[PDB]
Each structure stands twice: as structure tokens, then as C-alpha cells.
Amino acid sequence: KDRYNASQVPAEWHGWLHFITDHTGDELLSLKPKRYGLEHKENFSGEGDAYIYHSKGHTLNPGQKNWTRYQSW
Amino acid sequence: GNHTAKWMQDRSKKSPMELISEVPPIKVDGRIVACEGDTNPALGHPIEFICLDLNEPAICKYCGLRYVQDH
Amino acid sequence: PTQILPPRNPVGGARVHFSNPEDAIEVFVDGYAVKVPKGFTVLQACEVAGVDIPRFCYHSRLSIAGNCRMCLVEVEKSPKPVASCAMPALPGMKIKTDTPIAKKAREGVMEFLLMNHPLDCPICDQGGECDLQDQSMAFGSDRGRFTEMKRSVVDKNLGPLVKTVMTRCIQCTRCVRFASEVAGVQDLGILGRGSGEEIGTYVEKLMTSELSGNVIDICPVGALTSKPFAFKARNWELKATETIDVSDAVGSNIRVDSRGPEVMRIIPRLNEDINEEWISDKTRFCYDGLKRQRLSDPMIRDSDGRFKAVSWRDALAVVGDIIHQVKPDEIVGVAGQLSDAESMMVLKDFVNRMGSDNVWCEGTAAGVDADLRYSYLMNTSISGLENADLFLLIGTQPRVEAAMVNARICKTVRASNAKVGYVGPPAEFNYDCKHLGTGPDTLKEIAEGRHPFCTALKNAKNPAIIVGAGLFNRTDKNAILSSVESIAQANNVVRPDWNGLNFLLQYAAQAAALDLGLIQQSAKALESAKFVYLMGADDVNVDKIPKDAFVVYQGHHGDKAVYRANVILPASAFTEKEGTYENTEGFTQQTVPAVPTVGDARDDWKIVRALSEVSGVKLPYNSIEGVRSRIKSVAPNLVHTDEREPAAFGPSLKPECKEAMSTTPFQTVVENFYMTNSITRASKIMAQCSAVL
Amino acid sequence: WRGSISKSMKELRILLCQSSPASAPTRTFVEKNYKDLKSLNPKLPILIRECSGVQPQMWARYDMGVERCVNLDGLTEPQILKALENLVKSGA
Amino acid sequence: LARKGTGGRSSVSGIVATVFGATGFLGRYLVQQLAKMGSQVLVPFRGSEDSPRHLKLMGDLGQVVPMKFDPRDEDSIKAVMAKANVVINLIGREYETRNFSFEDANHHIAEKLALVAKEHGGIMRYIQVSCLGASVSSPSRMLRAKAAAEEAVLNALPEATIMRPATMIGTEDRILNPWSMFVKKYGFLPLIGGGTTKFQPVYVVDVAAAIVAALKDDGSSMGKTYELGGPDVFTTHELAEIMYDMIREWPRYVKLPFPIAKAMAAPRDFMVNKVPFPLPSPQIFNLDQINALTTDTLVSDNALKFQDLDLVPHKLKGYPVEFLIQYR
Amino acid sequence: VPPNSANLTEARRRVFDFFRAACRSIPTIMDIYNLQDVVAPSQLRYAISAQIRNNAHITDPKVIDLLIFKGMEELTDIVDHAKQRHHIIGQYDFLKNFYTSNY
Amino acid sequence: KYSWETLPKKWVKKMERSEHGNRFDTNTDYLFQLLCFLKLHTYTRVQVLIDICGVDYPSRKRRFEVVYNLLSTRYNSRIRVQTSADEVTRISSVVSLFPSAGWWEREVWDMFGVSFINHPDLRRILTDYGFEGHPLRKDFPLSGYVQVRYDDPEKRVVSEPIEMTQEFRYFDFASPWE
Amino acid sequence: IGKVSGIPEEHLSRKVIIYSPARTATQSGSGKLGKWKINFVSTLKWENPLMGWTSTGDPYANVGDSALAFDSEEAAKSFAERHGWDYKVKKPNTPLLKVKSYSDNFKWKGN
């Protein structure tokens, strides 16, 4: 009731709730893929690092990759 | 893997390469298979006809699924 | 009514070669007369008329085939659409390339080709650059009626170069002809009949032949694709530069297809005078070198033994100080085999004004005769070898070194039945080689007319005698060359209109070096010498340089010279710079910079000129055009780019001779051909091509 | 014909040109002189270089990398040889 | 360093800096130099996330990464200096705050960043920024602390450059912007000590250009305490003469003897006493800034000046003071 | 304005016209953008003359017409407060390059 | 077409088309005179300058091609008078005939650089104020020369430095066989 | 016409190469030949360190290839000389249509 925001509605229901479909999330839950299915993430935008998303060079991302195509000697 | 270590930094969810190398190869009858995709020929990849003359499983390039002759 | 018809020039600016202006056959291509020489197929009689007839298996360099019927133009009075590729133009023939029968024939065939063909276009490496896709999207029908089980074919293992997906392959037979004829190895085959036709080696047999990576450009379909360029890029991303190549001294033309800062794919490009449309597998797959083990920061040696990536000011300062505190005659300027003309000119002008004359290219051994330019050129053009009647490859193993010279030799052995003689070490040749002898003794046997092949060399109208610069290393180089020129004068080889005497080289810089007079006077240089200045030379024997020599390796990769180098100076590669190169036939190409230099590297000539100004010697020029003017001063041959400058001086000026050594037969100059230079040695593709032997 | 070239100069570069109307005296000079010159100086880099239109010059590298340029724009064979003699003399 | 670019704003300079005092008047010019010559900047901020917002621009998409850190808590300073090779230190205060004392904000931090950078072996250049004339036995406790900071950053970490900028002028500065908005007390300017002070201000852009110039330099400028003085050795009264040229006002100065000022700044010096209320940051009358104002030691001696950075400062008339036009 | 430059003479005449215009307009330039203290009228005249002389080797009349038009555009956008002022104040060997880049 | 019979032959000088909209590729000198015709004429009444499309052909000698469209609200027809003027050829302006040509010609000069004769207020309309260079040419790179603008210590000001961005990726889709 | 063109000064001392792009060796089709293109070398392309993509700094990065293609070396040279570039025209290497026929595959090797 506090700290709510949009995008907390999982994908099983985000269809039924925007009127795109007529399948309640209790019906699309038999269609979510078991092998690669992932739970929702609430869009942690700004709520601290390691919750926010980071590219692979941001220097905040653990494991900042180097893009230099040439492999130095 | 190493290729999959370039785009995935999670390293806790199984790498797609393993997710496809752990699915068993699909037995079939003839010498050519379809592998239209998942099940629906319109929600899968362009149909890729695979040859099963060899003994080892012949992977479908688009989906990674593997087919064997099953004689 | 005073119309303005289009010019109707040939299809690609194709020079039409009349054998004589009398036999010009006049045929009508869509009611527009064109004069084609006698013997032109209808397809060529249309390519003279600007009409581009869709062809799948007809390659101009390769033989003519009917393995598919994509051309099928309708000539006037034939009952069926004639395949344009094989129908010879008869005088008066009326070719209608766009009549409804021709277009229906083209649509018919492009439906058959796309019938058993798999939908691999998204996963096909040649998806954008595809003859099948671009002929279906231009001449083939918009829809396909075949809704059944396409045939599929397993993927043959053709080595670590050609990734093979024979299901895509349309069995046009172009590659099985290329390997039999141009590559001359005869490994590929059209096994089976019917739709079950499968192209490839019947037994698992890696395409051991070099020059067999060009089958991918030969292939009109993705099937045969570069395995090194596995999927890394697409036909549209690649920005193309019309660079040249520096691996081997043939100086083959090239397109460095780069995506951003790295070289994704190195593909050939038409240059009929050096490499028609083919490049050696040393050049196609050396691009992987340019991104591995690159030197990117100037590292000097600390007080321990490991390097320290100092800036350019500090490295140039230390090198300048150490040349100031050394005797002048102890400076040597070994220049790498990949160095361009400019940086070799700057190296010469630097180590000269420093009071030394010990600059020389990496490959040229002691006492080379770089005075007369015929003495280190392929006087007969690399195209000229097509008119040769008999070849005498003196050592030279041209399949290994200068692979496109051997491609021309094989093409001109197949087309005109020339016979070659081989006096060298036992080697494997694409064509019939007729090995004569192993050592120089059989060279005397020919010089004295006492050989069963001297009678051949005499009678031949246009003979050629290729003498590889790999035998300049031998101590009796003057004796060998004197016997060579004796064979020339005896068999009328070098005559005013043929000049069949030609020496090929194995290092790209070697021709430009010997042109700028970069001659190693003798030994006692590189020994008792204390400022060895390797300019990208890795094949220089670092066991010769004295332990106290302050080697300064201005390379770009470093294999063994870098470990000895008391200070490194990272230079640019051959794609990152713009260097004027000279191939063996004297043609003077000029690379065009494709990718940015890696790290803090600089141009070869920039590094040498900056080292000059840091080390006090004021050197006149300060730009690339300035040093090209200096080249015009020292050797104007290397300024008239893209123009071969023949040497107008025969061997009748070489003073005299000596005795040739009986022992020490001709030695294999290039052992690998897959690790001949630094770019090729640090590559991840050339290494692992060792399995291809 | 000079003999003392290998001990005075460092190299001699003759920029004759292949088939120009001019620079033909330079070609005649080389054709008639180079055999004997090199047989007399078996190690000097007497550089002969061709072109398409470059004026026929005769360069010369002395000890410390200096360079005299003698233009054989119209000099005949003995004139060219006298120019080379002056070049050899101006280095020793 | 490992520079792969042409100019900046998308180039790389191998300088992944952590400008500790970036969310400050000197910091915004230094961060803009470091991130307009194309180099990463790990701006660490102390409190409100709105502090370094004006620094998310002036750097191209991660060239400026504002990070949160507590000044007294390490293992967070080590996290800010995790991926870094340059560490500039602009953390300094001219006024004692009830929570952070003069040493705990000028000396006991610079020493702490010095130590936690020493530990994080890899900080190639560590610049330490302290006021000019910050030598021990200086009256202002801010300068004694800033001198101890230099002595502890050089000891605990040698080859660490030390800029000594004198009072820096520029937009949003602490030297001219308090005088204006006090000229808004009807032209009444209270130049303290009678303007006998001799101090050499400097356009903050040029202090930043020097702080970056000791980064782009070679191995030199390491352990060498520069003195970023500037041109035109001024006096407080004379500098005020130039303000009134920009802001259209009539010079109406007054002289204040130092006892009168130190008595007028006797309040706001009970900072450690008035616990349940923070005081409003003494702008013009600062007992410590006044102790510094007394002795005119704020002049560049024979120590290293801008000349030893191939750099010449801008003047203090014209544009380098044209931020005053917004007061007309 | 029609290109009466059927010859270099008319073009040069209108070059001098534009030069007189810019010179006689320098007062408003110095006023609107406040350069009467940083720059001297001699220096602004110097800069305008160095502009008109930097592009003096134009044997083409129409190119001179177009150059004068670009100059009149620049002036008219400087006279009025169309462009700012921090550019007007700005509008008014091999080794040292080698050390920086490769180009 | 009636318009070609009455029109003086010299005015339709170079070209004339007969589909996809008819055009009279005329000469720059006879242009505003040709635009005077087709308007204020009883059987050809256009009155409406729809558009003035600068078109840049770099491989021509007269680079640009100022394509004047023209609608004829009376006879319900549309004619496209064209011209050809290179970078330094002032072309006649038709703002006097169709006053809508004012802004269209300002845009043609701004984008391309085809200055217009006796056009009052011929001033860059679209591009930035201090813009140097003409964008819709061919040789003008897409990303512009100096057209990045960022804020800086020169507060309240956005500078105009040299430009640097993710490189525009030009894709060579064009296939052989046309 | 270089100065009136608004191009900055530093990009009119550029050295270009007026080539004609050779045929893509992979596909045997001449439908992209005869389109002469100025080639502003534009080699300087680093890798923007945040993401994996590249990042040019030269304005003339793409326009050499994209949208600036003439139809003849004379027009391309006239263009690169108006704007004052230092063009070095690299001639296109064209193929010899050597006479060839089918009946040459079945040649008789005498005996």
C-alpha cells in the first residue's frame, strides 16, 4: 500500500490488466516457460546500485569489460 | 562457455549453450527432419531440413535441437 | 527522331581483347549491334553490350559449364533458350535477353534452385552478398510453389578455413572446377547423381591446398564460407577499403572489409595484372593477426629486465641518446619485410646521416646486386607468364612463396600446354612440374647445354625462367645468377620483346628495399654492431646481434626480436597505414588505411623520422608527401603508383661470374608459408592451419 | 673506368628513364659504361633506376649522407662520365 | 595514458578519475576539464543526490559516474577508488561545521584518502588540493589543517602532486559572490583589515586547467607542490574595485579593524556548542578566513607557478569575472 | 542582390562596400556584445581586414559575391542579438604533432 | 499539352517530361520569366507555388536543381518547372510572383546554398543561427561538422565544438544486378 | 567553392582518394561498378568505452561511402578540386574479357 509503483504487475497478468487479452494470470501461468522462466524485478530504477541495471563498461558494473578489439601484448 | 562469457555476466542462470546441449536428441523416421520451430510453424524459425545420414546427431543451426536417424 | 540512347558500355568497364581487329563478330544484343572478337560466348557478347545476364556457375577465370540454366537468353532462330555461357556468338546472331521466353526461363530456373535450397539465408554467412538472393530478388519469381520436403545434405569437413553447409550449395560445380583447374589440387568432387549430388572430398580431406580459400568468393552461395569469418559480420556492415597485401611479395590486391576499428574480413578484388580474383590463404586469413599481440605502447627496458610502457617522448629520448653514444659504423638498420617504401626510405636517410651504411631489408642476404632492376624483379609481368612456353623454376618453390605467381603459372600451364622445369628441393606442385635436379649442379648442366631440358628451353618461342630470391642467401649467389643469365643468353630467353628472365621475391618490402638500394654490404654488420634498429623485422636472426647491442624493435607484433629489444617502438600494421609497396613484377601498389592504429602506435616512417629529429639529425621532409618526394629522388619507380616500370636493361651488363657450389643444394626458403611473417605468425588462424601442413 | 669510386662515394644513383627521347644519352652511357664500372668497383651500389618521364639525373651519396645531384638534361656520354668523375672527386 | 580518441566528449584518456570534491565550485570546472578531454570521472558525492546532477552532463554516458560515499567511513572510499588511476582531492571547508571539524574536513580526510589510495596500489597520480600559503603557523586553522594535509599526503603517498590554488574566483565562488549580495546592502562593502592584504586570485578555469595539466604531464609534477597563484597580485580593496566595474554600483567601501571583524565573527564560532541547530555557513565574516586575511602570505614565492605547466592564467578582468553581470 | 559581378571589378567594388559597412557597424557590435573594453577598434578592423584578405585570391567573381553574402549574413546575425557574444570575443613542429597522435 | 505550344520555345530550354507529373526543366535566366507565364495567363492559371525542392546532383556540373512545383487550382493540373544552379549561381527568385516562395527559397538557400536574386530577407530559416555549411547537400555529412552542443563552465551557454558520436553505420545494402 | 561551402578549414586540407569501388569478389555481378566515390580516409574510430560500439570523431566518416557517389572520374575530380581536397585518383582495375568457349574443355591431348 506504500512504495507501490507500476511494473510490479508480473507478465502473467500484465496482459489481462491492460485489456490486451482476456486470460487471467491464473490461466497464463500454465504457459509461462518452466526452463527459462524468470520472476519479475519491479524495475529497480535508481534504488541503489547492484539493483539498478548497468552496462558492461559502466565502472559500476562488477566486471567492467574492456572493448579494445586488439589484444595488447 | 567462453563465447557466452562475453554477453552474460550473471553466471548463475545456466548458459543457453548448456540449456540446449542438455536437451536429448529427437528420434525421427526418415533421413530429413523439419524442426519448424517450437511447435507452431509460424512461431518458430524458417523450416530447416536437416540430414541424418551421419551417425552423430545433426544439430538444427537456428534452434540447436538435435536429431538422430532412429533406424 | 534524334533520340538519346544510353552509351551501352561493357558490363564492368571490361576491356574487350580483340586477338585482331579483323575477326570481330557482330551480334545483336536486344537489337543493339556489338562487335565481339571471334569465340565470345553469348554471355560475353552481352557483357560487351552492357547487358548483365544472371550467371550462377559461369566464372570468367574458370571453365564454362551448364550445371544450371540461369542465363538462358533467347537467340533469334533457336528452338530453345540457349545457355549464354556456352553458346559461342555467331556472326549475325540476334540475342534477346529480356524477351518473355528469356525471363520465363530465368524464373523457372531460379525456382528450381530455391526449391531444394534450405531457408538458411538468416543463418547463412553470405546472406547479404549472395548471387542466389540477388538473382531471386531481381530475376527470379516473387513466390515459390514448392511445398514439400526439400533435400538436405550433411556438412563436409573441409578444414579450418572453408566452413561448409552443402545443403545451401546449389551444385553449380563452380568450386569443383576451381580446385581442379586454378587451385590445381583436385580434392573437391561432385559425388553422386541427381538431387543427391554432394560437392566435396569423398573421404574426409582438409583442402590441403593453399589458394583454396578463394572458393568462398568463387561460390555463388553461402554453402562454402570462410570459417575464420565464421559469422562475425554481415555483407552490409563491412566498410571496404581497396588496400593491397604485404604477406607475400606478389603484392596481391585486396579489400580489407573492416567494421569500425577492426578488420573483419579480407577479401580479394579484381586486378588482372597481379591476382585475377584470387588471394592466397596467407592473405585471406592473416587479418586475425592484426588484432592479436599488437604492440600498442612504447616500452623501454627498466633496471630489471621487464618492459615499462613509457610514453613516446621518453622512448625516443632514450633511443636518441643511445645512438649518440655509439660508434657510427656500429649502427645497423635492419628493415622489416612488411615495411613500406617510405619508412624504408626514412630508415635509409636516417641511418645514413648518422654516419652508417648498414641498413638492409630483412630477407636480402649479404651482397645482393640491387644495381640493375631486372636483377630483383619479375621482368615478365605476372600476367606476362601467360605467354610463356616453358618455365624453369630455379628453386623458388612458387606454390609456397608468391602464391599468385604460381596461380598464374598453373593457369598458363592448363590453358596453353606449357611445360615447366624445376631445379630445386623436392616439393609438391599443383601442375605437372618435371623436377630436374635438387642442386646447382643440374643448373650448370643446363648452363652448358648438356641437359635434356636445355633443348626444350631453346626451341620454345617464349620461355620464362623464374629464379626465386630465396637463393640469394647462398654464398655463391653471383655464380648461380651467372649460370642463370648464361641460360638466358643461350636460350634467347631475355629478348627485346619478351624478357623471359624474372626473379621473384618472397617479402613485400624486399622489392621496394632493393629498389631504394637497401643492400647489406657484407657481414661484420649486425655483429660488432651496437645499435641494431629492427624496423619490424622478426625473421632477422637475433642470435647474430651481439648481446650488447641495444636492439630497438620498431615492430608491430614482435615474436623473437621483441624479447631482445632494449626498447620497443610500436608501429602500424599494413592496413592501418598508407605505404607504397612494390611487388615482384615491379608493379607499385599503395595501401589505403582501413582501420585505426592500435593503442599508441605510429606510422613506420613517422616513428623513424621522429627518432631522427629526437636524435639530432635534421631530416628534410616532415610529411608523407615529402618522403614520397624523397623516394622520387632516390628511386622514382616507387612514386608512379599503380604502374609497372619495366627495367630496360638486360643481363648483358652484369660484369662476370664465378664457380657454382656443387654441395648445398637449393634450400627451402619458406618452410611454412603459413607463418612467413609477423602478422601471419601471431594469427590465430594461420597457427592451427599447421594441420593443413 | 674510374676505379676509385668504391673508396670515395657510398652509392651512385642514375635516374635514367626507360624510353624517353631525352635521357637517351644516359641510357647509352650506362649501356657502355656500367659493365666496366662495376667490374672495377665490385661492391659499390651503382643504382640504376627507371621511370616514365623523370629527368635523367645522377645522384651520389657520400660519407655522412650528403647528396650531390647532377642533372644530365642534355649531357652526352663523355659529359656524363665527366660529371661522374666530378662526383667522385668531390667526395675525396 | 591509454588514450584512444581525438579530442574529448567521446574520447578516452586512460584517466578514470575520482575527483573527491567534484560537487563543489572548483570541482565543476575540474570535472568538466577531465570529462571534456574525454576521461572517466568517478565523482563521489556526500549527501543529496542532487549534488552532482550538474555533473551527469559534461561527460558522455558514463564518463562521469556520480557515486555515494561517507567521508568518515572507509571501505566506501575504497569502493569509490576501486576502478581508478587518478585521484584528485578537492574535499575542503573554509568554515567549521558542527559535525566535521577543520581537521576532520581538511587534514584527517586528505590523509585518509591518501592512505586508502596507497593501499589501492594503482593510483598513478594523486593530486592533493590545498589553499596557497597553507603552511603551518598560519593563523587560519583552515590553512594549518590544509598544511598538515599536504604533509600527510606526501608522507603517506610520495610522488603525489599538490596544487596550492590561492583564493579562486569564478561563478558560484566563495570570494566574489559573498561580496556581491553584500553590495546588496546598499553598496556597503566591508573590506576587512583595510585592504592591506595582498593575495593573488586566479580564474577557477585556470586552476582546473592546471590540475589536469599535472595529469597529462609526464612523470614530472609528482611530489612537487605547485602554487597556482595567477596574475596581477591584487589587494582585497583593489579586487573589489573590479567587481564594481562589472556590477553597476558605486564604490562605497568601509574599513574594518581586525578586532572589530573578529568580534563580528565571534558568533558562528560556537559551532561545536549549538548542537541542535546548524549555523548558516558564514559567508563573508569568517573568523578563520579573517585570520588568513590578516597576513598577506597569499603570494606566490619562488615555488612552482603556472609557468611550470606550460600554462599562463587568464586575467581577472573581462570574462574571467563576467559572472558578476548577473548582479547588475 | 543580383550578381552584377560580370567581372572582378564590380565584385571588388561591392567587397569594399561590405568592408565599409562592417567597419561603420563596428560601433553597434562593440555596444550590443560589450567588446569596447576587451578589443580595440583597431583590432576589430584588423580582423575584418584579415578576413577579407584571407580570401582575397578568388579569381572567380561569383565566389566573391557568395563570400560577401556569407559575410553580410554573419554581420547581420552579429549586429542583432541573434548569435551570442562568447564567440565574437573568439572571432576577434612535426615532432610536437607526432607526440600527440598518428594523424 | 497546351502549355508547351503557347510557351515561347526558348523558355522551356533544356528538358521536358511527360509523366509522373510533367516538368519544364528550364534555364535559370528564363525561370522567373517562365514562372511569370503559367500564372497570370488565361489558359494556364497556376497561382499556387506548392513547393520549391532543392535537389543536389553532385555528379552534374550544375550541382543543384531547384524544382519549383506549381499547382493550378483553376484547371486542376500540376506543373513542375525546374532549373539548375551550382553553388555560386544566384538564381532568380519568384517571391514577387508567388509570395509563398519567400520561405521556400530561404530553405533552399539554407539547405543547399542556391542564393536567390532580389529575394527580400534571404536569411537562413531552418538551420542553427551560427550554422556554417549547407546540410541538404550531398557532401555535407549526416552528423554535421561542428554540431554537438553541450553545457559547460561557460554557464547558461551551450558551446558548439567539433562533433563526435557513435559512428553512423552506413549499410551497403545495394545489391548487384540492380 | 571550398570557402563558400561552409566546410570548416581543417576538413579542406583533407587528403581524399577518388577510387571506383571494385566488384564485391563474393558475388559475380556488376551492378555496383562505375560509381566513382571520394574516399575521405577517415581512419580514426575508437571504441566508446561505456558500450561495445565504436565512435568516430571525423565528420566525414560515412559520407565518403554514403550518399556521395558520382558517376565519372571527371565529375568526382571536379568535385574534390572545387572543395580544395588533395585527391589522389586510384584508377579502377577492369577485367579482360578473354575469348573463351565451351569446346575448349574437351580439348584433345594428342598422342
Ligand SMILES: NC(=O)C1=CN([C@@H]2O[C@H](COP(=O)(O)OP(=O)(O)OC[C@H]3O[C@@H](n4cnc5c(N)ncnc54)[C@H](OP(=O)(O)O)[C@@H]3O)[C@@H](O)[C@H]2O)C=CC1
Ligand atoms: N573556494 C576558494 O576560494 C578556495 C578553495 N580552495 C580549495 O579548493 C578545494 C575545492 O574548493 P571548493 O569546491 O570551492 O570548496 P567547497 O567548500 O565548495 O567544497 C568543495 C567540495 O568539498 C566537499 N567537502 C568539503 N568538506 C567535506 C567534508 N567534511 N566531507 C565531505 N566532503 C566535503 C564538498 O562536499 P559537499 O558539496 O557535499 O559539501 C564539495 O564536494 C578545497 O580544498 C578548497 O579549500 C583553494 C583556494 C581557495
Ligand code: SF4
Ligand atoms: S546462399 Fe545463403 S543467403 Fe543466399 S539464398 Fe542460399 S541460404 Fe539464402
Ligand code: SF4
Ligand atoms: S559448393 Fe558453392 S561453388 Fe561448389 S557447387 Fe555448391 S554452390 Fe557451387
Ligand code: FES
Ligand atoms: S551460368 Fe551460364 S547457364 Fe549456368
Ligand SMILES: [Zn+2]
Ligand atoms: Zn530448429
